[PDB]
Symmetry: none
Subunit: 289 residues, 6 copies
């Protein structure tokens, strides 16, 4: 039986060493009451460009999109480097698990990834985004299949997903076949229908849906946490930014998979069959002796 | 641009020629205002045994389960026969499309199927249930893959699903790959979470979710109809049995698939790949010349 | 709800018009109490050669097998002919159904067949024996697949089998796939294990096992009748020859197929699959215009 | 010429390391007289939930079925793991063959399997149950075709079956086509008709039917052992729990298949033909390089 | 039980009313001892041209083949006409069956046919020759399939064949499928191997092989009669011309078909299958109203 | 132009490695004079049970048939295995062709087959028996159509047949249509009529009839060899066992098919037509991926 927290804070949107101390003070203030798992929202370190259109008509490419793009590119990180050693030391000083929504660069590209840290300051892995939604295709990149993780912990098996990857059926039935029961899902939209889109995943799974959205200035995000029977523990606080916590009874899953039970004993293997191609494909591959 | 109706009535649970005239009078009363598509709930003709347990401990099989089962078996139909000719003549007299939730027999078995009729009194086909949920396994049967239909009409493409087949991800992404935009879904549960489980399918698709539940005596079912942007047109009437109608603008789908667009241009074919085995398999196959 | 009788009498073994009047007097004496279905044993008209070996070493063929074989061949019938018109007139005078174990000839061969008559004196068909057992191969013939009948009556569906065709699994699961619920089985062995070999078919089916054996002078045959729950109604009378009757409640089948239910909803079609080749194959086929 | 034993003991129904030492002391007490093959009943390690109904009406799902199901799920094993290494070491210390009825888990499911061990402590394979009977469908799982084993030993060829798979004709004529002559069949019912249902398999085969049922507190099971001529060697001891042994003359099979001889020289291939589809089908299949 | 005679006489080779009285005096001399079936040799009325080659090199066609052919053509008969009325009156005056080897004409062709008469002077039918052997192709004609007869009599079923049609396997297994047990076979060769070629047909059938050859001046023909067990009753008289008789026990066939039994219960219909096309085909067919 | 030998020896009837060295010493003693083709009799390796009746009345089945059958079953071979590798090495050491009459087992059945070996120790194929004759049906098995071979060699085309398959007309006209001109025919009867039954096949074919029978202690078999004009080269030696040889002029076939010529230019295709169904049919057919 564990207990987990989510946050709802926002970034200062520029100069990423300034927003990295907010993470320190909030994670300590969440650590003061014996918390054990902390989830941060989407694009909390790199920043999420809202409202701007970069002046893209069809391919006119005016001069006030280029300077805007290079000022946005100059505020991203790269893993592993000097910017994740501070977060590893942050999560290492005491006992807490840590997922984190950052934005990485790799040679003048931008991938909207997410990170995973354990209680001993190790770097488990990362999960890049499969496909950006509508206009984020112009600036971000596509992820491959050799990134979806397993990540078993001594408090259960934790996974992740980003904003509009929760709507795919195939990716969720690829997550369910590995045994996820703590299903973190950061996002960056604020609508009323998001709660009704999460309750379906909570019923279809057996997993504690544990989301997080950010609040800034008005695009008022609402985060929550849902039991695997459709029971909202801590409600959708639309009012301000705060810390949101609840307890997680891990004996409430084997009593919840008595009814439905996805990729076991439903999902008839004699008629349906899925297979995922998971190859680490890269364009140019050097080889020496 | 069409308009469609659902019903919420119940059966008399015994003596199926008596409940077949309720269908006549309700379908005419729904036809008086120029309706064009009528959806009936799950197990409306055969009857839905609620509350009874048939006295099944682990395999004790007391004598008061056998007489109950034969009295229930004596009130089912068989297709095609004298019981569907009356429904074909019912839908043939004027212009209406008709889906219908019945229970068929085939040599001392019970399949929970669903029927499809056009405006000219033809019998298009049927869709048996893939797997019953928990205790219905003791009395009902399993369906195969060679039953999931396409059924294009001159008002669009219509499909169906039953109570807990809407929770599978693989069956819904097999329905979406054929091009369903009017997604009928009869059911026989009455909970609050069913509306939030339908809104996710309405967003993930692009289809007019058009459900129907029954109301009897208290297991108060609530039926509804949902636009493909998450807009409930006619609300979940939990109060009594009535007729529920709305209009369906078929120009609200190509403007709804500008954002998401499942099995096209999302659902990356380079990493995921699904294939459905659809063979009409039967146990004993006679062959002559 | 019907009632059926079996007999246990023997033949006079020679001169077949003499044994054809015993059939008349026994069938009238069974008809005096409102009986409706009468079953006669195996080889009741032609005769069953017991004890004789025809002096066959390996192919020595002494002279005292040939005269014995021609004296046995001179006491068989041929269908349809003057010998079945008398049985049709016998069953036509009042209302009774009739199965009958005879031996037919067809050009110096001997087939151990069985006959079927309705209440109006019609000749429905016949069912030849698939393969004789051990030493009967020397004198009898092999049957083909285009003989296994359906024979629906207005009191149910009746079929048949002979002595050691009840031990094949494939022939019984070919009988079950047509819907037999009154499973007549004449035989010509008298052992203790035959009752335990019939109770398994009564459980595996759902059919009223209705057997008949003959008693002569000591090879004391015992006939019986078994409910589809394993309930012997009229016992195995090993003592003398008599008439044996019981009643048949046809509402005791849909309550018996609640548990097991062969070729429906057991017998998984996704893994097993049987197919029967049923062609009327004959050696020399004349064709004209 | 070998000799084999069966047991009739029961489990302590909870806390599976406690019931695993009863197996040790009984298997040594059976090993003291030079035994060579030991058969344990159905669900001897995981436990067989008798009498409880889990409060399932039609889908009401009250709270006192969930805690009962999770307390039952917390007492199952998983293969291969730390619980079968002790049984391999148990059968390895001296010379004995071992079949064993356990219950395995695989990600919050329950399969009612059976195990096979040789005299050298190797793990040959397993045979999951094809379909549970009536109410066990609510908790257990369905097996596929790629599990039915051959398992030739230097004392003959051994196979298995579970409670109501012995009533299928197709599965038994799929077992017979591989050459089974020691046909183990654990079960968990106690009726009088089970002996008469086993004698038919003993005649139809040529195999030593070697069953085992459990006795607890009254559901008094009776185990036995049957020669391939219909000769009960050690009787159906309905009184208490004990050890039951006999000798097995393996020269009593080629003299028993002189009469009948299934899938050889009976079972006419020109008319009947069976084919079994045996594919290891699984829902989600990962593939890498 | 009948008795039959064959003859061995020769023709006067020219002027066919002269050789027609030899038939009268020989048939009366054979009728004096209560005979019942008389067989005459091949080409007894028309004449058999022996030794002459007609001077045919490859197509030189010298003048001394034409006059020889017209002198041979001027000594043939035509059926039905004034030449068969005398034979019908010959066989009508008392009780005898009659087969007869003649040569018919039909518009400047020559067919080597055979005739059949009963005890009442009726004309049953005829059997033309299928194909002449080597050099007879130059003068004779080919027969069709619509000529092979059945001809049941009140002393059995009689058929026929000519010189080298007894060597075909297909024609003999087309004769056997109609039920021939008195198998007449006229011929016109005189070799030692003919007796060994007839004994095989007598064993393969079950029929009384009853042949006849002619003796003239030295081409000494030898006729015989063979039981269906390989027992020559009246021997091959190579010395002169005479009358040859024996008795025919018709109870020696059902004791002879206990061993072999062609087109019944041998001749596996599941692998072999023969079909004979029997259409009365003619070149020019007039049709009127 | 080749030369061929037959043998007439007998088996020691028990313990088949003892009778396998007689084959070695006789085949070398036949190889000393430049022989090229060696034919062994019917059932030379497995043994031919003569005189015994196994005590079969009609189905009494006394105890002294079972032990006799298992002692006979324990002396048969199985192909391909360790018993044919020695014969392949036997025929491989020098140049000789080899046909051989053995008895094979396949899972407690007995098939009376025949084998074929070339000069290089290869295993060409086998020809099982189509149907056993009268009493051999009780112990042996039926062959299918997918076994009749072609087997062209660089000395001609060789085929085979067994005891009473030479009497069928359809099987011989199926052998003739493949082009057999060396027609081996082992047998196990000793009568006078067998020579007259072989001379007909020698005339009807064009093939060197090359038979072989065994001699033991009195059932004195007589083997021979026949030219395709009806000329016995080496006579029917009824006296003792010996080696019998002759020469085979292969230019004596195209001069023998000038007269008759079966399935060419006789056997009128416009009226007769045969077709053979040749499918490898088996009862239970496993299929995997």
């Amino acid at each position: 039986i564990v207990r987990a927290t989510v946050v709802q804070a926002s970034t200062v949107f520029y100069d990423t060493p300034a927003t990295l101390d907010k993470a320190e003070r909030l994670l300590s203030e969440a650590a003061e009451n014996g918390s054990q798992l902390v989830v941060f929202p989407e694009a909390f370190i790199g920043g999420y460009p809202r409202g701007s259109t970069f002046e893209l008509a069809i391919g006119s490419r005016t001069a006030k999109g280029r300077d805007d793009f290079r000022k946005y590119h100059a505020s991203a990180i790269d893993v592993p480097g000097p910017e994740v050693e501070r977060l590893a030391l942050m999560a290492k000083k005491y006992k807490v698990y840590l997922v984190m929504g950052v934005i990485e660069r790799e040679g003048y590209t931008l991938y909207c990834t997410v990170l995973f840290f354990d209680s001993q300051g190790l770097f488990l892995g990362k999960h890049r985004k499969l496909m950006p939604t509508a206009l984020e295709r112009c600036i971000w990149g596509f992820g491959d299949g050799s990134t979806i993780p397993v990540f078993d912990t001594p408090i259960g098996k934790i996974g992740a997903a980003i904003c509009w990857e929760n709507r795919m059926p195939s990716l969720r039935t690829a997550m369910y076949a590995k045994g996820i029961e703590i299903y973190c899902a950061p996002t960056a939209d604020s609508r009323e229908t998001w709660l009704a889109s999460m309750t379906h995943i909570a019923l279809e799974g057996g997993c504690f849906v544990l989301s997080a959205n950010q609040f800034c200035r008005v695009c008022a995000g609402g985060s929550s946490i849902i039991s695997p029977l459709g029971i909202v523990l801590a409600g959708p606080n639309y009012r301000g930014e705060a810390l949101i916590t609840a307890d997680l009874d891990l004996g409430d899953i084997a009593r919840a998979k008595f009814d439905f039970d996805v990729v076991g004993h439903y999902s008839r293997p004699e008629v349906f069959s899925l297979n995922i191609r998971e190859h680490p494909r890269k364009a140019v591959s050097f080889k020496t002796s």
